[PDB]
Amino acid sequence: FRKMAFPSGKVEGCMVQVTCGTTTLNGLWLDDVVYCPRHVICTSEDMLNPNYEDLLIRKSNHNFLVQAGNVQLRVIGHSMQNCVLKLKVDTANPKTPKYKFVRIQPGQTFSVLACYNGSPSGVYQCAMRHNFTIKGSFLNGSCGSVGFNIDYDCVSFCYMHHMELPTGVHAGTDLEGNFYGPFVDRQTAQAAGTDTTITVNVLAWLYAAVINGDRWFLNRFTTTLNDFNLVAMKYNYEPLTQDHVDILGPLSAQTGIAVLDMCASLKELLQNGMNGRTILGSALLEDEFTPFDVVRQC
Amino acid sequence: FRKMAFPSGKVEGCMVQVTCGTTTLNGLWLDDVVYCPRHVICTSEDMLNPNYEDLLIRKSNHNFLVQAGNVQLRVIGHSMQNCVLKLKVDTANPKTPKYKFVRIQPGQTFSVLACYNGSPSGVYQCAMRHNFTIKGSFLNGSCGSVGFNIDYDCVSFCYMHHMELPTGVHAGTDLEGNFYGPFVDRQTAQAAGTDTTITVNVLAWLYAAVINGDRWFLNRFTTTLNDFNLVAMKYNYEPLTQDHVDILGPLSAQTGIAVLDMCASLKELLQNGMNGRTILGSALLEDEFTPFDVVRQCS
Numbered sequence: 132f133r134k135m136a137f138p139s140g141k142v143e144g145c146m147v148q149v150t151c152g153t154t155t156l157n158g159l160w161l162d163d164v165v166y167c168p169r170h171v172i173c174t175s176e177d178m179l180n181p182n183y184e185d186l187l188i189r190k191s192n193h194n195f196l197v198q199a200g201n202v203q204l205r206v207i208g209h210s211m212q213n214c215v216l217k218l219k220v221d222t223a224n225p226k227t228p229k230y231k232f233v234r235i236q237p238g239q240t241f242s243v244l245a246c247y248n249g250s251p252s253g254v255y256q257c258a259m260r261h262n263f264t265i266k267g268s269f270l271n272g273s274c275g276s277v278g279f280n281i282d283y284d285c286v287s288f289c290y291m292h293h294m295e296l297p298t299g300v301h302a303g304t305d306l307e308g309n310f311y312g313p314f315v316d317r318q319t320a321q322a323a324g325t326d327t328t329i330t331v332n333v334l335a336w337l338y339a340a341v342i343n344g345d346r347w348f349l350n351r352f353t354t355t356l357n358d359f360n361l362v363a364m365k366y367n368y369e370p371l372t373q374d375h376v377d378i379l380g381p382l383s384a385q386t387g388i389a390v391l392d393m394c395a396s397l398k399e400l401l402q403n404g405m406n407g408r409t410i411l412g413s414a415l416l417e418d419e420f421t422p423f424d425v426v427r428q429c
Numbered sequence: 430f431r432k433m434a435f436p437s438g439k440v441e442g443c444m445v446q447v448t449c450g451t452t453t454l455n456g457l458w459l460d461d462v463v464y465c466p467r468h469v470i471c472t473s474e475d476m477l478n479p480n481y482e483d484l485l486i487r488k489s490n491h492n493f494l495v496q497a498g499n500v501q502l503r504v505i506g507h508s509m510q511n512c513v514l515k516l517k518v519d520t521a522n523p524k525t526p527k528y529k530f531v532r533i534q535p536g537q538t539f540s541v542l543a544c545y546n547g548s549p550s551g552v553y554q555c556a557m558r559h560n561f562t563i564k565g566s567f568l569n570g571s572c573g574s575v576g577f578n579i580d581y582d583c584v585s586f587c588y589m590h591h592m593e594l595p596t597g598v599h600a601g602t603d604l605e606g607n608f609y610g611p612f613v614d615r616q617t618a619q620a621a622g623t624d625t626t627i628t629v630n631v632l633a634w635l636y637a638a639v640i641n642g643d644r645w646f647l648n649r650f651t652t653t654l655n656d657f658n659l660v661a662m663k664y665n666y667e668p669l670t671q672d673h674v675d676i677l678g679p680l681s682a683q684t685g686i687a688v689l690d691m692c693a694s695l696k697e698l699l700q701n702g703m704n705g706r707t708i709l710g711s712a713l714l715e716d717e718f719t720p721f722d723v724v725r726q727c728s
């Protein structure tokens with residue numbers, strides 16, 4: 132098993148660069164709108180304590196340089212929606228895929244198309260952590276890079292990149308400009324909350340192990356969801372939601388192992404350890420493969 | 430620090446489906462030629478011990494069905510180069526990127542665009558191992574998927590996928606149809622040579638760990654190149670050459686940790702183990718980042 136990104140071609144065709152003054156970042160060009168982080172309107176000194184409403188008052192359409200490659204797209208309108216800027220341009224993107232904007236939950240994974248100066252650079256899989264950070268790979272100029280999932284050639288955009296935290300993890304918004312978690316786009320010291328292990332994904336990994344014949348950890352016990360959740364929190368594991376139980380449905384059917392039976396196996400693992408044994412070749416439980424990632428890969 | 434693949438769009442526009450009889454796989458469509466694994470011409474019975482030249486002479490252009498999305502391409506010529514089939518089509522691919530065919534050496538990394546039925550499915554980074562296998566994620570129908578690197582808009586194709594070994598690792602050819610390693614495109618269980626670890630990559634990844642604030646494995650000890658190589662060979666690691674030491678130059682200068690000081694760190698790790706500790710979130714020593722991969726992602 133390995134982390135596998137979605138093919139990025141549909142998103143590459145939507146990446147542009149957006150510049151205000153000397154501040155440059157990436158934007159997402161869908162139909163005749165470009166979406167980008169609103170701090171493009173900041174000077175480096177104003178990022179310390181910006182008043183975005185006041186800064187935007189002083190901007191006009193002609194203050195924004197939007198380029199596809201070195202080709203300028205004329206801006207014909209602008210507005211701010213939460214922490215993103217929406218720039219109306221005079222050209223509809225002929226490479227616009229079928230798409231939706233979605234807000235994801237902790238645990239969900241997505242592909243990141245890392246971009247610099249509007250040019251795609253790399254693609255990799257990320258998971259949204261419990262503290263609403265992602266363990267990304269982002270350098271200066273990466274803001275406006277997006278995270279996405281693809282379902283039958285429809286691109287679901289779920290993340291746009293805005294900042295790095297002091298711990299080295301990253302924070303951003305959905306495509307409506309609403310940050311994930313309690314962060315703000317100000318260059319002020321901020322701290323990620325405590326992280327937890329993503330229970331639903333560890334369970335998916337246990338099902339993946341069972342599908343491949345590694346099933347020593349299956350025990351004879353069951354549990355209720357509430358009893359499991361209370362024990363799991365003592366090991367810094369996330370409690371399960373009803374949506375989590377449901378998204379494990381397909382893997383449960385495939386293996387014939389009830390979701391709550393698997394929880395009982397995981398609870399035994401947490402309370403007793405692995406005992407010098409291994410699961411899918413490792414003694415560490417993996418928590419960045421969703422149930423969909425397991426089925427998609429298998 | 431993540432395993433990052435190149436953006437796959439330039440390759441996606443080249444993937445097509447190639448069907449011969451009952452067998453379906455992927456092809457790579459560049460200009461007016463489609464490249465695909467030659468075992469597409471086999472039936473289920475041909476695969477055990479196929480005489481490919483004999484099987485191919487009995488095929489006509491119309492035995493090959495090539496679908497590009499929803500459009501069928503017309504095959505107007507076919508030839509075989511080693512384990513690769515070249516189908517000439519009557520249409521030039523307008524999305525053909527600037528490209529090169531390259532044969533990579535062990536330790537080099539590349540991105541894989543996994544495809545089924547001519548449709549891209551996922552992208553991930555692989556490395557050519559010392560025994561010329563790769564640790565991929567490939568299922569039935571993935572043959573003809575390609576591996577590649579991208580440098581200033583030019584796609585360097587280095588791998589075409591052909592087979593899975595019983596150990597679960599994968600084998601294939603360059604785009605001239607020559608296998609990496611001692612493998613053959615016949616339906617038999619084949620073993621690889623001993624899998625020696627690419628030492629220069631493990632050292633690059635340790636430098637990546639330091640650049641990202643991980644230092645628990647560092648020590649004050651030092652080692653000569655030959656004394657390090659004695660321990661490396663004992664643990665089935667490839668010997669480090671002076672060229673490897675030079676290639677690690679930029680990472681050494683950036684961290685201030687001499688290459689041989691990092692070698693003494695790795696030697697301790699090999700002899701003492703990691704003792705339950707982790708490096709960049711990994712419990713094992715990662716060997717699929719080249720020095721260039723580390724410098725590119727880290728800067």
Ligand SMILES: *[C@H](O)[C@H](C[C@@H]1CCNC1=O)NC(=O)[C@H](CC(C)C)NC(=O)OCc1ccccc1
Pocket residue numbers: 156170173178269270271272273274275293294295296301315316317318
């Ligand atoms: C946008 O390109 C940039 C992304 C940062 C650059 C370093 N790594 C990243 O992920 N975002 C910012 O610079 C952001 C702007 C504020 C208005 C939110 N500030 C920020 O991330 O502060 C932390 C930081 C800044 C510079 C280097 C390292 C961390």
Ligand SMILES: *[C@H](O)[C@H](C[C@@H]1CCNC1=O)NC(=O)[C@H](CC(C)C)NC(=O)OCc1ccccc1
Pocket residue numbers: 454468476567568569570571572573591592593594595599613614615616617618619
């Ligand atoms: C091409 O789509 C396919 C890729 C394999 C399918 C399973 N996972 C893959 O990566 N290639 C083959 O099926 C290949 C056919 C040529 C060698 C003619 N055969 C194969 O990989 O089987 C290897 C094997 C044969 C016998 C015992 C154990 C392994």
